[PDB]
Amino acid sequence: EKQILCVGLVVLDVISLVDKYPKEDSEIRCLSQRWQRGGNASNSCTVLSLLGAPCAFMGSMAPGHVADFVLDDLRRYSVDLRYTVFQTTGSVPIATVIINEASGSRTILYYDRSLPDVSATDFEKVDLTQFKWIHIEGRNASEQVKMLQRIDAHNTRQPPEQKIRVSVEVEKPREELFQLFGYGDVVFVSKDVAKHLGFQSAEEALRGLYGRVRKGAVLVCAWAEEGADALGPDGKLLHSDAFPPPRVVDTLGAGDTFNASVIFSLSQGRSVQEALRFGCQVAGKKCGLQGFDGIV
Amino acid sequence: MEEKQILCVGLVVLDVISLVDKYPKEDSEIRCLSQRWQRGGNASNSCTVLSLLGAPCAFMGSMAPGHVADFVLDDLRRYSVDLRYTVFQTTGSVPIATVIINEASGSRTILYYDRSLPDVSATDFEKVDLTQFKWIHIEGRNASEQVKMLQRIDAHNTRQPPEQKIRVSVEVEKPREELFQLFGYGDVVFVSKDVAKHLGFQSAEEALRGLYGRVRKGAVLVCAWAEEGADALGPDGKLLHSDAFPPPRVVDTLGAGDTFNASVIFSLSQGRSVQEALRFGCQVAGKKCGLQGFDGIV
C-alpha cells in the first residue's frame, strides 16, 4: 500500500520537565526527564503513524547508541526505515529541551553534530511508485529543489489519479528556504518565518506570500493561539480557531502535529477548511499531554 | 602501611553541559557554543580536585550498570580514585543533570533528574574498613542513614588515640529540612550560600553566627559566599575570612563549591590552620572559575 514519505532530520531531544522557568545561576529539581526522538519531519511521522496512516521517514543517520534508540523508536511506530541514509561522518544532532509545565513553553538548546544532509543523489534512489504523498522539511534548499523537480518530472508521466501530492515546510527564517515556496501542492509557512518577513497575522502572511506559490498550490500558516489559516487558488481565505487544552503543558512538536494532521486530513480527501480544523484539534489536544501518544 | 586515604561518601552524576553566549529566553531556540559530557556530583567533583592536588582518595557511591556508569567509572579511574566501596544497585540508574553554562556571565544553571537509584545505606557503610582513611567527607543526602554512618565513625574514634582519630566533614548544600540535622555532626561542617539564603541569612557572617549553636562541640562551620569570599567560625568565636580570588574572566563556575570544599579538606588534612585552609580554598576555586572543567587548576 502507498505510504506518505517524510524527508527531513531526526534529532534526539533531552527533555527536562519543570514547574517554573529556571532563573539563571540556580539549581532546579525536574518534575521528570525523558528522551524523545525529535526533528520536524520525524515528529510528523510519529503523528501520521498515531493517526493510522502508513508512512516512511527519510533522514540522515550515523551508526551507534543514538541511532539504535532512534531506529528502535521509529520501529515502535511502524515508521518505514527503508530510506534511512547512513553517513560515515558526523553524529545524530542532540537538542536540550526545557519544558515549563506551568506555562507550556519549550526552550531548545541545539547542538549541530556535522551530520551530512540527505542529498539529491540519495533521493534519486527513492522508488516513487511507493508513495502517494511526499513531505519535505526545508533545510538544504538547493538539493531539495532537485528532489522536488524529480517528483514534478515523475508526475508529468502519471495520470491525475496517480500523481504524488507534495508538501513543503518553510519553518526557519533563512533566505535559502524561500525558493521552496514555488514547489509543492501544499506549502506550510511558520509564524516565525512570517514575523521575520514583517507580517503580523496569518491572513497578512498568506496574502503577502501567495504570489510565491506554484499555480494551484495551498499556502498554510498556523499562528499558535490565533489558530491557523490557509489560502488556495480560489482566493478564499480559510480559518480555524485554535483549540487550546484546559492546561497547556507541552508545546514541543505542536507545529509538527498540526502539519501531519493537515497532511493526513487532505490525503483522506477532506476540504482545506476541514483539514485546518482537524490540525488545530489534534495539535491543541497534544498541547495538553506530554509527548504524542495520548492524541489517540 | 601506605598513606591513608580521604573517603568521600556521596553521589556521582552525569552532567550534560550546554555552553551558551547568553541566557536563553523562555520559549526560544538557541545554538550552543559547545556541548559536553562531564562527570559531576558534589563528593565526586571533590575527589577530582583531591586527586589533582595529589591527595590519595576514595569514593563511595551508588551505581547502576550501563553506558552512563561506564563513562563515570572510567572517568574516576583516570584520576586514580579508589572505587572498592562502589555500591552496585539492581534498580534505578545513574542520575543525569542538565547544566547551562553562560560563558558571558560565568553562571551555571542546573536541572537535576533523580533516577530512583537507591542511596548508600548505613548497612553498606558498616562494611567499610575505617583503618584505611584519615578523613571522611559526607555529602548530605539521606540524612537519617548518614547520621548512623557518622555515629559509626564517632564510635571507631573512641577506641583510637588522638593521632589515629579520623577527621570528619559534612556538606549541607541543598535547602532540604532533612539535612539540617547533619549540622550537629563532623569536625568541619560546610553550609552552602544557597542553604544560608533559604534560611533567611544575607551574608556568610550572619549564617555562621546564626547556625553555630547547631554544630557539635569543637566543630568549625564553613560558608563560602561566591565573589564575597569565604568565612569560617570555630569554638573560640573568632570569625575567620578570606576574600575571593576571581579569575580575569569568569567562564565556568560548575563545581566551584566542590573545588572549595576539597581544597579546604586537603589543606586541613595536612595540618594547616583554618585561616590558611580558607585562603587556599578561595585560591583554588577562584582559579577553577577561570577555566572549563577541573584539570587546569594544576
Ligand SMILES: CS(=O)(=O)c1cccc2[nH]c3c(c12)CCCc1ccc(CN2CC[C@](O)(c4ccccc4)C2)cc1-3
Ligand atoms: C496547530 S496549533 O494548535 O494552532 C499550534 C501550532 C504550533 C504551536 C502552537 N502553540 C499553541 C498552539 C499551537 C495552539 C493551541 C495551544 C496553545 C496555547 C497557548 C499558547 C501560548 N503559550 C505557549 C508558551 C508561550 O508561548 C510562552 C512564551 C514565553 C513564556 C511563557 C509561555 C505562550 C500556544 C499554543
Ligand SMILES: CS(=O)(=O)c1cccc2[nH]c3c(c12)CCCc1ccc(CN2CC[C@](O)(c4ccccc4)C2)cc1-3
Ligand atoms: C570558593 S569560592 O572561590 O569563593 C567560590 C565558590 C563557589 C562558587 C563561586 N562563585 C564565584 C566564586 C565561588 C569566587 C570567585 C569567582 C567568582 C566570580 C564572580 C561570581 C559572580 N558571578 C557568577 C555567576 C553570577 O552569580 C550570576 C548570577 C545571575 C546571573 C548571571 C550571573 C555572577 C562568582 C564567583
